[PDB]
Every structure is written in structure tokens, then in C-alpha cells.
């Protein structure tokens, strides 16, 4: 051993808790030295005072379950992610996948920073009044880099390896299941930085906050015939979230959204997060 | 006996006498990347004496009508020391940190600061005021350097999220009657085991005066705030020529 210098802790493990905590009986306590009601919030730790260290309690055996607040149950509810309309006019649309254009499901997913899950999509299709007609349709998922279709009768619709679904409008809605398909180990909804290299100028200001690990290509629908169809189409997509893992919670947004890609807000009417009252003593 | 503390790492030492405890964010200590989670093939470098030491940034001045400040990491350390040179010659880095914030005053001043650590702190703009502009913040704002930038609307943290629930992040307070230093230890948090040090900011550090500073006329009116940081388990990989920014 010619060099003595080159030869040279987790805090808390998790546990299974099906129901809420019980309450143990307590009596009065008069003494010095022991004081559980005085805390110190400057340490960044929450208070650990329970009921029995403050008041006198009875014995309570509660069987209230904690199943409902698991994150698998919080997210397993299909919500609307897109509305696609074919009035555009040439019998086909291309819709680049961006699932944050509706504020209800966006506020739930933006509670966490990182998330990793499986999805399940459902496609509800009708005319713009709800009336159904017999008409054949085709949806195609285009991964990033593949050639996207440019016409109703293009060669891209031959779907030799792209997954496609054929359906007619008088069916039940179509349902598929998607894996976790990122190059990274989780999706992230907030990306602080620029994706590219180089000296940043005004032209580089338009790139801030764009993570390339979340771009999943386009999604193309069309009517399968080769001439003009006489009907209008309106498609709605709903998404469930299964097998969820989530990391690092965040504050929840209190201002209304403006755009799909950035946290910009309307700076004139800053909405207060609480409703105001007249005087502080009289509620 | 718990009020005093001393932190020594590298060839530097911080001593304090009016301290709260030390906060370890999410109960995890910074460590090296194990071979199960690693993906890059080449051997990483670990200097660990010249880069794991306390670095002291500039000094702000707490006025009676201050808004707040924010710093970005590891943007603050890309131009100083041996850390700033290894980050320019390499392509990937991975590190934890240790932030220490000093602000002292007398027994006749009063105030309260909230020191919090928010990962992936993406900024926002007021959309031109009217709300019809798809504007974007400039480069001097998103990456302010080792000087740091001030907040314009601290109630929404310039990001649309309220200050009232900033305490869900790992945080401490500086109450001027009890303590005068706050200290948080941050591990490496990302979806990837390594990342570039010039394109991506891991977390941000916010210091916001919740209760405003007050004193009487005749007392000391220059109350400064100082931030001091130290990398913990820094590794670098992917050698290259120097890229300045």
C-alpha cells in the first residue's frame, strides 16, 4: 500500500399503509422540559405534533382506506386531448402530436416534473352535428422521420410498416394501446434550456423550452376512397394513463393558459389565487 | 449545541453560529453513477479536489422594496475555477450541489426570506401585456450568469405558479431573529444519467423576501445577501475542444 489515500445513507424506507392512522387515548399532562406545541418552521421541516400531544383524545379505530389517492387512480380517467375537423379540404389532415391543447388534463399532468406511463387512445368520430353516416376512414401513426402523406392518394398510405387502423363510422370507437416510447427514461413537461448548440442570438430565442424527447411525430387521417367524399368529419381523441410513475411534485398553475408550448401568461390581469373579502376580522 | 455548525469540503470551510439544521432534498445523498444506470462507454474523469469546494458568487443588497432574485444551476459555475474549465472541454457532466445562503443583521432589524430550490424552473413572459404575443424571454434572462437576475412579478414567480405553495420544494427560511444562514443539499435529478453543461439548467434557486425588511432610522441600512455553492460528486465525460458557450 504505497498510497494510503487512494485506498480510502438512505433516510427513510417506505412501508405499506392500507388505512389511515388510529388514535390513542390521552390524558392531561403538566410538566416542564417537554413541549411538543412549540415548533420551528425555519428548519424546512413540517410539524410533527399529533392530536394527543395537544388535546385529550379518545380511542378511535378508523378503517378509512387510502386507495383513492394512489396515483394510479388519480390518472386512470380518459380526457379529451384533440378535436380534428375535415371541412383540410382535400380529404386528409396531418396533426402533429401535442397533447397539451386542453386545460383540464394539462393541469393534472403538470403537477409532476417527470412522468412515465402507458397510454390508451380512443377515437370518437361523427359529423359536426353528431349524425352518423356509413363512411370508411383510416388513421395512420407516423413516427418521427418517416415521410408524411401529401395527398389523399399518396404512396404513404400503403402502410407497409406504419401502424394503421381502418374503421367505419357506424362502429364502436377504436381503441389502441401505446407503450412508453421515449429515448429518455421519463417524459418531462418542463425543460429549462435550448436543445441545440451554438451562440444564442434573437433567432435562437424561439427554441427555448423545447424538449426533443417528447416529439412523437404526426397522426394522419383520411377517407379511404379516391374521389371527393360528400361528408364532413369531426374526430375527438380521449386518452387514459396506465402504469404510472411520477417524480418531483410542483406547484399547480393558477393563471389561464395561452399557448401550447410555453408558460407565458397574460400580464395585465394577474388573477389573485384567492377570493377577496372586505375586512379581516369579519368573515 | 445544535445552533453551531461547520461544513468542510475541499480546501474551504464554512462556520456558522446561528443555524437551523441541514436539509437534504428528498432524503438522498449525492453519489456517483453506478454501472447499472450508466450508458456511455468511455471512462469518466473525477477530479474531486479541485472541483468539490465552496464557490462564492456576488453579493446582493436587500432594500426595503426589493422583489427577489434567482440563480440557475450549473450556469453560475461555467466561468469560474477548474469547474468552469472542465465543463467547457467536456460534453457530459453529472453532479450534486450544496447551497449556503448567508444574510445577517442585528437584533433590532426584522424580516424573513424564503430560500427554495425548484427543479426545471422554466421562465415565462407577460405576452406583451395584452396576452396576444407569443413572446420569448431573452438570453440574458434565461441564463443570467453568476450575477443573477431579479423578479418582475414575484407573486407568480414569473412562471404562472403561486408563491404560496413554493414550500412543496425543498426549502428553508431565514428569519432574522432566529437564524442567519440556510443550507440545502441537492442530489442529481434528471431523466438521464449525464447531461450537457452548456445547454441545460438542472434547477433554480429562488430567494424572495416574504416579510419586508424594516428597521429604524439611524441603524445600518446596507443589509447584504451572499450565496455560496459547492459541487459534491462531479464527474465529466466526453473530452473535446473548448466550447465557450
Amino acid at each position: 500500500d504505497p498510497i494510503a489515500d487512494m485506498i480510502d445513507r438512505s433516510l427513510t424506507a417506505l412501508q405499506v399503509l392500507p388505512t389511515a392512522a388510529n388514535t390513542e387515548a390521552s390524558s392531561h399532562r403538566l410538566g416542564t422540559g417537554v413541549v411538543p406545541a412549540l415548533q420551528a418552521a425555519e428548519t424546512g421541516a413540517s410539524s410533527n405534533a399529533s392530536d394527543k400531544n395537544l388535546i385529550e383524545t379518545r380511542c378511535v379505530l378508523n378503517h378509512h382506506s387510502t386507495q383513492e389517492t394512489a396515483i394510479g387512480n388519480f390518472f386512470s380517467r380518459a380526457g379529451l386531448v384533440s378535436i380534428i375537423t375535415m371541412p383540410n379540404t382535400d380529404g386528409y389532415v396531418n396533426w402533429d402530436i401535442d397533447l397539451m391543447g386542453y386545460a383540464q388534463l394539462r393541469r393534472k399532468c403538470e403537477l409532476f416534473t417527470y412522468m412515465r406511463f402507458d397510454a390508451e387512445f380512443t377515437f370518437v368520430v361523427a359529423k359536426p352535428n353528431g349524425v352518423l353516416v356509413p363512411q370508411l376512414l383510416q388513421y395512420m401513426y407516423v413516427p418521427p422521420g418517416a415521410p408524411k402523406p401529401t395527398s389523399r392518394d399518396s404512396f404513404a398510405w400503403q402502410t407497409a410498416t406504419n401502424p394503421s387502423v381502418f374503421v367505419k363510422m357506424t362502429d364502436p370507437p377504436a381503441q389502441v394501446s401505446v407503450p412508453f416510447m421515449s429515448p429518455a427514461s421519463a417524459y418531462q413537461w418542463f425543460y429549462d434550456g435550448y436543445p441545440t448548440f451554438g451562440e444564442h442570438l434573437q433567432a435562437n430565442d424561439l427554441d427555448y423550452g423545447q424538449c426533443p424527447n417528447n416529439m412523437m411525430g404526426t397522426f394522419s387521417i383520411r377517407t379511404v376512397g379516391t374521389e371527393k367524399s360528400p361528408h364532413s368529419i369531426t374526430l375527438r381523441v380521449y386518452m387514459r394513463i396506465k402504469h404510472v410513475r411520477a417524480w418531483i411534485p410542483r406547484p399547480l398553475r393558477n393563471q389561464p393558459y395561452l399557448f401550447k408550448t410555453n408558460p407565458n401568461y397574460k400580464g395585465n390581469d394577474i388573477k389573485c389565487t384567492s377570493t377577496s373579502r372586505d375586512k379581516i376580522t369579519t368573515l | 449545541s445544535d445552533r453551531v455548525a461547520q461544513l468542510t469540503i475541499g480546501n474551504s470551510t464554512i462556520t456558522t453560529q446561528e443555524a437551523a439544521n441541514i436539509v437534504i432534498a428528498y432524503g438522498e445523498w449525492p453519489e456517483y453513477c453506478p454501472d447499472t444506470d450508466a450508458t456511455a462507454v468511455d471512462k469518466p474523469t473525477r477530479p474531486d479536489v479541485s472541483v468539490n469546494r465552496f464557490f462564492t458568487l456576488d453579493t446582493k443588497s436587500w432594500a426595503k422594496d426589493s422583489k427577489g432574485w434567482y440563480w440557475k444551476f450549473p450556469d453560475v459555475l461555467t466561468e469560474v475555477g477548474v469547474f468552469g474549465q472542465n465543463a467547457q472541454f467536456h460534453y457530459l457532466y453529472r453532479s450534486g450541489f450544496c447551497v449556503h445562503v448567508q444574510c445577517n443583521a442585528s437584533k433590532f432589524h426584522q424580516g424573513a426570506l424564503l430560500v427554495a430550490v425548484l427543479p426545471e424552473y422554466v421562465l415565462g413572459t407577460i405576452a406583451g401585456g395584452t396576452g396576444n404575443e407569443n413572446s420569448h424571454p431573452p438570453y440574458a434572462t434565461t441564463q443570467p450568469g453568476q450575477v443573477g437576475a431579479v423578479l418582475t412579478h414575484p407573486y407568480v414567480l414569473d412562471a404562472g405558479i403561486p408563491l404560496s405553495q413554493l414550500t412543496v420544494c425543498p426549502h428553508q427560511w431565514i428569519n432574522l431573529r432566529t437564524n442567519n444562514c440556510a443550507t440545502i443539499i441537492v442530489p442529481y435529478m434528471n431523466t438521464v444519467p449525464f447531461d450537457s453543461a452548456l445547454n441545460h439548467c438542472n434547477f433554480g434557486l429562488l430567494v424572495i423576501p416574504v416579510v419586508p425588511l424594516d428597521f429604524n432610522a439611524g441603524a445600518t441600512s446596507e443589509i447584504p445577501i451572499t450565496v455560496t455553492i459547492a459541487p459534491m460528486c462531479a464527474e465529466f465525460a466526453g473530452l473535446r475542444q473548448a466550447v465557450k458557450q
Partner: antibody
Amino acid sequence: EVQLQQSGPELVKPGASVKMSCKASGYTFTDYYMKWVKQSHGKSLEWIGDINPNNGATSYNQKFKGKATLTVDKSSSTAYMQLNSLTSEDSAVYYCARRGYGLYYAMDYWGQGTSVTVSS
Amino acid sequence: EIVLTQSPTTMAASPGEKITITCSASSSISSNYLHWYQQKPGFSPKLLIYRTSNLASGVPARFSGSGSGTSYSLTIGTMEAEDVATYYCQQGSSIPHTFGGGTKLEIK
């Protein structure tokens, strides 16, 4: 090959809004940026602003902010420039160009060049 | 804003003679963001020179330039005059990026 196709010249009165729209093809619209340059008579060419087609992020010159707004739609491969509060002094030729990749941020392809004239 | 003074305003020379077109910038700027453009009469402009020394495809290699700091020059010294046009130097290091004053030439 890659060529930029613009719209024809449009005549309106002072105090009304008008639209000008240039469309490109032959390459992927999402990968490259788009700039708008204004060339007036007796002056040099002047930069209005540039725009990212992927997210709709925008930018404007500080003399032209409030004068004209930029926007884009991703599917139809079109980027159009709205002109509000026109005076007689805005009568010039407007070019749309794209930024280059291997170049050091240089415009390499330009449009046909649309023209606006303003009179009563 | 950053002003570009492109000098002279007029030019008339013979074939085979040197043509020197000078731009003067108020601030010392980065040389690699400077560009040169060529406008055929009645047609859209065309990029000639990027990086102040290099050329795009479709351009003969007679065009070159060398400049640093305040003064910036581009030089053509060849015989053919099928390209009579207006020339603009466009800097892009500082925001907003602005063009030059303008230089047009005439032949004999």
C-alpha cells in the same frame, strides 16, 4: 429543388387591414425558420421579424412592433403576415426568406417579392 | 441601433480592374456573422458571401473579402460584367440585424 412562392400585389386604402401570404414546398417546413424583409425606395432593406413554424414563436423589430404581426399554420405549409394600420409610407416591397443551416445564419432562398401600395 | 455606412455610393471601372466595396461599422463586431448579398434588377436578392471569405454553390470563386473590426471590404477584380447589380453588406452579430447602405456599379 426548393423555391419560395408568394402572393400577388394587393391594393387597399390607408386605414384598413390586408393580408400577404407566401407558401413554400420541396422541403420540410418544420425544420427551418422564416424571415420577413421590407425593402423601401430610397432606403435599405429592413428586417421585420422572424418566426419558428414549429411552435408559433415570433419576433418583431422594435420599430415595427404594432405595425405587423406574424403567424403560421403547420399542416398547410404556409406562413402569412398580417398588416394593420397602413399609411402611405408602408408602400414598399416585402420579401419572405428562410434561414440556412450550414451557413452562419444566412438567408439563402427568397420569394418572388410581393408589393403593397397605399392610396385613396 | 447599429449603423452600417457602406462607401462609396457609385462605381464605374473597366474589365480586369479591381473593385473595392467598403463597409464601416460603428462597433467592433464579430467577423463571422457578416454576409454579402446580390440583387439582380427586378429580381430577388441572392447570397454571395458567408463567413466573409466563402461562397455558395453556383458562384464563381473570384469573389473574396477580408475585414475586421470597423472596416470591411469585398473585392472582385475580373473581366466579365454579365453581373451588374446592387450589393449589400448585412451584419448579424447584434440585434436587430441590419443591412448596409447600398452599392451599385456601372460598366463601360
